[PDB]
Design a protein around this ligand. Structure first.
Ligand SMILES: Nc1ncnc2c1ncn2[C@@H]1O[C@H](COP(=O)(O)OP(=O)(O)OC[C@H]2O[C@H](O)[C@H](O)[C@@H]2O)[C@@H](O)[C@H]1O
Ligand SMILES: Nc1ncnc2c1ncn2[C@@H]1O[C@H](COP(=O)(O)OP(=O)(O)OC[C@H]2O[C@H](O)[C@H](O)[C@@H]2O)[C@@H](O)[C@H]1O
Ligand SMILES: Nc1ncnc2c1ncn2[C@@H]1O[C@H](COP(=O)(O)OP(=O)(O)OC[C@H]2O[C@H](O)[C@H](O)[C@@H]2O)[C@@H](O)[C@H]1O
Ligand SMILES: Nc1ncnc2c1ncn2[C@@H]1O[C@H](COP(=O)(O)OP(=O)(O)OC[C@H]2O[C@H](O)[C@H](O)[C@@H]2O)[C@@H](O)[C@H]1O
Lengths: 400, 85, 395, 400, 390
């Protein structure tokens, strides 16, 4: 259930490998959509279920006329909600170029009813998304322990920790506000708040001779919006729920770019963002430093851009990575029988290697977020050298 | 490595000072053979009254020698300038 | 005919501004389609008036039936071919998906005809395309001076040169294997060659007692293709002529989809756009740095995304650019009296701007590639006869 | 069956010896034609057994009319091929200067049908030789592991590894073009590749101050190099060679010419234009003439006069170690007590019967094969437990 | 006529360039069958003359039956002989492999005469070959000076001189044995002497002497091969009694695959080793920087040596100094259609435009003896005779 180098490993050596990893110069963590399941979050399968359960006519057009999704996959919940938002976007361009006025109106619905089941799944508390002090609830109990452990294990001279994520939800902000810890995110101001790339190079200091961290959101957020061509603006939850969120859930309007999220599969076609490209320049530059460690959790390995970075960063002798995947046994089988999808093949090529800088952890519920957070150590504030306390431990079994 | 080469020319010394229209030049022993053959002729300037040149990327600066002296012991030269090419 | 600051400048001061610009920390060049005209190449309006001549019965559907082209610009020869191809490329996909056969059968006829014209013009040598040592010839003489000067004008411990291009030919690769230097292009291997982006961050050195440069192609190459679903491959000219570059030219209706990576054609796929995106990324990341100089030649200023990027970079006081444009006169005349295209308005505005960070050179034939290459500085071969002497010593 | 310095040692000290030989400045490996048997290759006995039952008319003539091979060794397949390929050239060089005109045509057949049988062996895959992604199969699983281990076992400052070989196949390029490792081999270019003796001194570097690489020396040539009347050596690919010159050799039945550069003969100093065969054997002797040097040998039958002299004359340096793998050691010690034996069973017994502790020999039949050699090699210990005070951790287990 | 690459010099203009080139790090000398005349040697032409007018009857088959030689160059007295020997060994080997009688005997009869005429010329003292202190004599007086000064003109911490050679005789050994310096040739032992290529990398050193190397290119009279595949060296007093005497005083007897001189039996994988291991060292010595090479006695009739010395010149810190006596007699023949590669190459060399090729000619002022004098400079008998008589 734990592999390291293609061979097998056991718990009491894993727990001491993890301890040695957390004392390195650079430590990081990349999270996904499963991490936020024990808080009210959802997953893409459930998005598809919700879609085919509330809109039964568009689902009929989508199989009979245009032939974009099959019946086997629909009935057995295998569709990808990421390669469909692209085909539906491709049809619209043609229909609009050659001036048809019915297919240019039966696709806007299909495309605005999918952007609406993806926001409700990023609200974690419902109508109480607009209220205050939502990090005092007990669902957010392990997100605090993660941050506490990460920070506390740093000594003077070393750098602060980094956190990468794809989710749009607000779950680490809510939980760091409840401790008093500042997260740098690239924005500055309160009455008009804007993105400046050179706000990732700052740090704190005390003026009479401190805890902080960095957060990189790679696929956007729910509180960002663009008006001009070179001005992105941030806003709070209560001031967003009023303007442009309660008008695309409870009113059934057509969709225009109220907020910037990247849910599709080809994220370069959008050639106006200019903020997607500042995060990956930092990811790839983080992985290229000597003495670097990365933990991964919640990610399904279905993104063609991140896999290439991870796969090409393993040509450096001082980079370590740890990966959690619950459904590993059901993938080795399907790949030994000559099948498998592009996700299972990518993780099997990682499991089957000969470099001791890779480690994979299966086991179902043992590879969950709540268990990931308990494998991490607390620090020893004053370390007993213990030879008085160690030779006695020897005397215990020595004596008889 | 591959075919591409850059260096062709050899020299005698290098500039070390400028003190108000008065240049100071330190001489070498690295060019064991102060002979440096090239397309047309060979030359070596080792006496006053002679002319020398310096390249400044885009132009050539022309100087006349005036003195020589010491300070394996070191040697120096003194020169003035008369124009450019 | 040389405006720096909106105020005329003379050639002997120009030729000394260049020598100073070429001493900075970052130096780069951006080329275009015109730079390949003294080697056997063509331009993007010749390519269109050689199409509407041979194929005049496909030029009625594209206007009256499917609305991809406009009569005004089709008559004035002001069409953009990249976008036309990239749109005809997805019409076909949609039809293939929804099972509309009669139109799927027609778009193949259209694309097998467009690719013929865009391919012929880009071999530069006809049938000798598939042979060796094509850079010894005399048409590639003004492509080696560029690369030799740009290198010899560098000091030790200093960045190497960068060349961005919009063409999809090999004039610039054939002319460096002769010299004997190494070009980085993001590929590696010989029996299976693949794209690795991290390669643009490497270099060479020596361990006992060596010259390289970087090449970025923004529109592709004749030498790249796709056969799997997640891997892009590169081959040699001889190995491509056999596979596909010959059927394209000497067969009528041969077309295989989602296979070719030129010119900017199949961009909806998520494995081919990955290749086009990194180049633009790296360009916009180079153009934004202290102590940077860019020379432009051959480019027509008809792209909306490059102009925005060049302008946004003039808010930094240590970026300098040099431009070349022959039809400046005819452009100013038309723009004065409320006219001109979006390509002339931009360059006229740049000319008018009151900056000392912009220089324009328009003199007709005086703004060409061969003059550009002689405006660069060189400071101020008896070693050859021996090799042919030895070759004469056969027996 | 492991003899060190003439004595015997066991498989618990052998391993701690290997683990200390792999921690030195210089490390290398010389391979042969047996290492390519677990992938589809063949040996010289097989070449002879396939020449016999395919060209029985000329074998008669060789035994009878020219007296080149004894009728005895034939029956038991004891013939050497590298002397038979050398005698025919001697015959053809006199028939020519004499101007006879019916022996040239009788020896060209014998010198073509004999070059045809090596290629078919050195292809290893038949018709899938002209295809791509050929190192993703299982056959090369033990070639990948060797490179992985040899690289991983280095440190900062140490020199990169080298690999010398005599075979013609590509079972060592195919395997690295899957991991993503770059092997240096002398050539440079894509559209016009050429041999330069100066790009063996190249290495990597980064720009923000690809750290895996190695070197490859082929000693007898390759199935992919060709010399042109231009007097240069050119390299092409495995799909551009098949369709160009090694599709006629097999199927055409035409005469031979120096189309590709292989020499299996015994004394190929005759070739005086062989300036590529003189850099390899200079680097080989410049390698073993350095302090703190280790070499492993596998797959070599010790029937080459040039290499054994190098091995011998290198033993007078006190900081040079070898390891050797010879399966038929018992059967060859038996055959020398009778004062008989071949000329290759003496060169190995001479080594096995020394008194220096810098020579180790391994027999055991199927225990000296390539797949056991690779498993005798270690993995590295990344975070070494200092365990001067956690030495008692070992006592902790059981003393009650 | 001191021509210097399209120019002209004088005695001192030369005699200072030599002092300049003698301060370099890598110094090298090359000698052929010319410098061996003052001591009693013969060129390649006299031996062919003698063979012609001593063994006429068998000279025909070489031109009529087996076609080894050309009648034109045979008459002109310009014909290479060691290649002929090498090829005849091959013929004999083939005719002995396939069991035939007449062609076997017909070549066993020719090898003897050839080896006879080629050994007599190289004995170099007659019947005082099996005796001691042959280097005290007067003929070996300039080699001693050469060695002494070429060694003395060296700095502390500098490399050692290199001497390549195309002869197969014992003069430079007899002379160094008189001086008292140590030569290295790649051999070791006294009761069983064997070849070790890696011995060229050794060097002496003191604890509280001087030496040099010697590279032969065609073999020697004292190297041979016994029934077992190892190559052995021997002394003259021993070789004379072993084989040479019969070679010189018996009409028909031959031993195949035994002797190693001159480039005779290269078709054996045990013998070509020791030839190739010299030429590759030559190459690796050339390819070094800051090197000088003095050529005195060679006739430039060799494809490979020509090619190597030609390719060597690309990098500029390799200097060549040729000696050639009969130069104008070829300058005045190259104007016309007649000419041989020997002279074509040397005139091509003198027609260069850089200051490295330094051809020299004086008819008799370009000789070994003057070559020696061109170089710089850094009672025992009475006492020993007194002790003797006392
Ligand atoms: N409680 C849990 N704890 C940890 N992991 C879990 C849990 N429950 C399920 N899983 C695992 O969670 C995994 C399923 O995660 P997926 O639905 O693929 O999310 P994604 O992030 O990969 O892809 C979506 C993004 O991809 C694009 O980038 C878009 O931007 C999208 O935002 C499985 O392996 C489960 O075993
Ligand atoms: N010998 C010459 N030397 C230099 N320049 C020349 C020469 N001859 C003509 N010219 C100039 O060369 C220019 C040719 O302009 P175009 O054919 O548009 O080249 P492109 O690279 O912009 O076209 C591709 C773009 O089109 C799409 O917008 C895509 O975005 C592509 O980026 C003319 O203005 C001539 O003055
Ligand atoms: N599975 C195996 N694993 C390891 N070794 C094996 C295996 N099977 C057989 N062997 C051993 O592999 C060896 C095979 O002996 P040969 O075919 O003569 O090896 P070569 O490469 O020298 O032969 C050609 C070269 O020989 C000349 O030197 C020239 O250089 C030629 O290029 C035996 O010792 C087997 O015990
Ligand atoms: N006293 C003297 N001092 C100096 N030079 C002399 C003297 N006497 C004659 N010479 C010159 O010495 C030269 C004698 O030339 P030759 O003996 O034929 O040439 P080689 O000794 O290199 O022959 C060996 C080659 O033969 C095969 O081809 C192999 O390839 C060998 O390489 C004349 O030019 C005289 O001017």
């Amino acid at each position: 259930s734990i592999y390291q180098g293609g061979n097998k490993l056991n718990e009491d050596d894993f727990r001491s490998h993890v301890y040695s990893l957390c004392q390195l110069d650079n430590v990081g963590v990349l999270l996904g959509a499963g991490a936020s399941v024990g808080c009210g979050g959802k997953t893409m399968k459930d998005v598809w279920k919700s879609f085919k359960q509330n809109y039964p006519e568009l689902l009929g057009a989508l199989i009979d006329k245009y032939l974009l999704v099959s019946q086997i996959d629909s009935d057995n919940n295998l569709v990808n909600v990421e390669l469909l938002i692209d085909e539906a976007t491709k049809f619209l361009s043609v229909a609009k170029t050659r001036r048809c006025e019915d297919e240019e109106e039966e696709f806007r619905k299909i495309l605005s009813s999918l952007y609406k089941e993806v926001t409700k799944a990023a609200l974690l508390t419902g109508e109480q998304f607009r209220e205050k002090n939502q990090g005092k609830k007990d669902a957010f109990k392990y997100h605090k322990e993660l941050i506490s452990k990460l920070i506390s294990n740093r000594q003077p001279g070393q750098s602060a920790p980094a956190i990468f994520t794809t989710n749009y939800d607000l779950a680490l902000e809510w939980a760091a506000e409840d401790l008093g810890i500042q997260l740098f995110n690239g924005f500055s101001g309160l009455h008009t708040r804007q993105f400046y790339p050179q706000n990732f190079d700052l740090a704190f200091r005390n003026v009479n001779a401190h805890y902080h961290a960095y957060l990189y959101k790679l696929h956007g957020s729910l509180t960002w919006y663009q008006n001009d061509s070179l001005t992105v603006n941030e806003v709070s939850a209560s001031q967003a729920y009023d303007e442009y969120i309660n008008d695309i859930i409870n009113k059934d309007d057509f969709y225009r770019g109220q907020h910037l999220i990247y849910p599709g599969a080809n994220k370069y076609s959008h050639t106006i963002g200019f903020v997607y490209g500042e995060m990956f320049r930092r990811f790839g530059e983080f992985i290229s430093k000597p003495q670097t460690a990365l933990f991964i959790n919640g990610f399904g390995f279905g993104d063609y851009h991140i896999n290439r970075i991870i796969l090409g960063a393993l040509l450096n002798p001082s980079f370590h990575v740890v990966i959690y995947y619950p459904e590993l046994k059901e993938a080795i089988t399907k790949v030994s029988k000559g099948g498998g999808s592009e996700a299972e093949k990518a993780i099997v090529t990682l499991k089957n290697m000969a470099f001791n800088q890779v480690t994979v952890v299966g086991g179902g519920s043992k590879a969950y977020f709540n268990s990931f957070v308990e494998h991490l150590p607390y620090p020893v504030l004053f370390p007993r050298d213990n030879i008085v306390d160690e030779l006695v431990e020897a005397i215990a079994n020595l004596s008889k | 490595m591959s075919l591409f080469k850059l260096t062709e020319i050899s020299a005698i010394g290098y500039v070390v000072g400028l003190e108000g229209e008065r240049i100071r030049i330190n001489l070498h022993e690295g060019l064991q053979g102060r002979l440096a053959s090239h397309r047309k002729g060979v030359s070596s300037v080792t006496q006053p009254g002679d002319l020398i040149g310096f390249d400044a990327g885009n132009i050539l600066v022309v100087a006349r020698v005036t003195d020589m002296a010491f300070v394996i012991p070191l040697r120096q030269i003194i020169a003035y300038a008369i124009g450019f090419v």
